[PDB]
Amino acid sequence: AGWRSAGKAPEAAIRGEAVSLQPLDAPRHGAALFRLFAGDDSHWEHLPYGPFEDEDAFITWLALTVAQSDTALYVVCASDQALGFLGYRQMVQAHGAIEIGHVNFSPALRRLATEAVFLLLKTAFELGYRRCEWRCDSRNAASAAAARRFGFQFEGTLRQAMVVKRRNRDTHVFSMLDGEWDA
Amino acid sequence: SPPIAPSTPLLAGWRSAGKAPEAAIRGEAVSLQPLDAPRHGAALFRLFAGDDSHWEHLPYGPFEDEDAFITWLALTVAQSDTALYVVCAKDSDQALGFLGYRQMVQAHGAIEIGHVNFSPALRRTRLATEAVFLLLKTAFELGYRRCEWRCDSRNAASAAAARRFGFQFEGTLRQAMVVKRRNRDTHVFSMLDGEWDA
Ligand code: NA
Ligand code: NA
């Protein structure tokens, strides 16, 4: 009512109980995050990117990903040991709409995993977003269960939304509204 | 809770879908001409200048004058993922409305038919139906796998049009946008390549 916009993603650490989320510095954190997933290429199964040939390739993907205005990534730490990353996508202030995505958690992280997500959930609603989305490949059982567990409501399935590694992807779309966050 | 999809085979001969045509798309009663924002602009403006209710469920309009409308058109078509076309009777230059693609994602073969702006004389006529059919045909011939149609949930006529055209309802994105100082929930509809075949 005189709605203008939701707030900007944090440019300083988001401090939790078990976890700190550090704004991602692609060329700095990049090598650390690359090493987290090297060796286990099955990590890139339910995702549209990866694996990466080498650190250069990973840093390239990270730079180009974070260069988008609508995307902001954070590094998960306990210490400054990077344990995974995640962030916001389709971040549109004017509509108070945002998505929590790019969840890339090391086997060691996958209660700290849960807190990383909630910190961004909490932060998006405190910055006055109206809608937070969560999306996943329909083959991804764990992600879908995670969404329900956090309180996201299933809205529908975007059929044939993507081709991921030459296979079909249907995207499940879930959302929490600001009235839902309150309740 | 929503389906768990099983493993499926690889898609044979998958490649990125093509770019939007840069030449006219010719049908039997209609042709879709690539929009030339500053040339076609004043004609299209006049078409809607009269009844501001046209814009009621859309995220733009009305336009205070021609220049505002040309400015909007130009900035909309400047986006690399949007292409618009002017609806003309076959082999005529008389603009009867416009429409096009947005959110083109060539790498995933996903596209959205939108910016459907039909004059009253065009609405609910055989040329309107052909205009939309020509963008579907064209998208699937270009290798798109999924064609969306989206509307404000309060836009009854657009939802019924989508269904009439054979898009399937997928769901509603609640509080997706703030449009003209009110909430918008968005209905999402789609037509898949295999549905188009049938
Ligand atoms: Na960014
Ligand atoms: Na364009």
By what technique were these coordinates determined? X-ray
User: Using CA atoms, how far apart are residues A30 and A42, in angstroms rounded to an integer?
Assistant: 20
Who among A138, A155, A161 is closest to B146 (CB)?
A: A161
The shortest C-alpha distance from B144 to chain A (Å) reads: 10
Query: Is B190 in contact with A139 (Cβ distance < 8 A)?
Result: no
Which of A46, A163, A177 best probes binding to B when mutated, by most B CB atoms within 10 angstroms? A163
In angstroms, the Cα distances linking B50 to B44, B69, B164 are 11, 14, 28
Q: A143: CA distance to ligand 1 center in Å?
A: 24
Cis peptide preceding B21, ω within 30 of 0? no
Can you give the CATH number for the domain in which A132 is found?
Answer: 3.40.630.30
From chain B, the residues in CB contact with A155 under 8 A are 171-174
* CB contact at 8 A, A180 and B174: no
Which of A160, A172, A181 best probes binding to B when mutated, by most B CB atoms within 10 angstroms? A160
Query: Is B171 in contact with A173 (Cβ distance < 8 A)?
Result: yes
* CB contact at 8 A, A62 and A24: yes
Spacing of C-alpha B78 from chain mean position: 16
Which residues have CB atoms below 5 A from the ion given as ligand 1? A 66, 71
Report the number of secondary-structure helices (H) and strands (E) in chain A.
Answer: 5, 8
Alpha carbons within 13 A on the beta-carbon side of A98: 31
Query: Is A167 in contact with B3 (Cβ distance < 8 A)?
Result: no
Instruction: Give the range of the structural domain holding residue A114, as residue numbers without chain letter.
Output: 1-183
* CB contact at 8 A, A101 and A88: yes
User: Using CA atoms, how far apart are residues B151 and B57, in angstroms rounded to an integer?
Assistant: 8
Task: Locate B110 and state its tokens.
Answer: 């996903």
Locate tokens 């009867």: which residue?
B96
Enumerate residues 6+ apart whose C-beta is below 8 A from A107.
Answer: A40
Q: What is the resolution of this structure in A?
A: 1.9
**Three-state SS string across chain B, please?**
CCCCCCCCCCCCCCCCCCCCCCCCEECCCEEEEECCHHHHHHHHHHHHHCCHHHHCCCCCCCCCCHHHHHHHHHHHHHCCCCEEEEEEECCCCCEEEEEEEEEEEHHHCEEEEEEEEECCCCCCCHHHHHHHHHHHHHHHHCCCCEEEEEEECCCHHHHHHHHHHCCEEEEEEEEEEEECCEEEEEEEEEEEHHHHHC
The shortest C-alpha distance from A20 to chain B (Å) reads: 29
Query: Is B171 in contact with A156 (Cβ distance < 8 A)?
Result: yes
The number of C-beta contacts closer than 8 angstroms across A and B is: 94
Task: Locate B179 and state its tokens.
Answer: 């449009």
**How many structural domains is chain A composed of?**
1
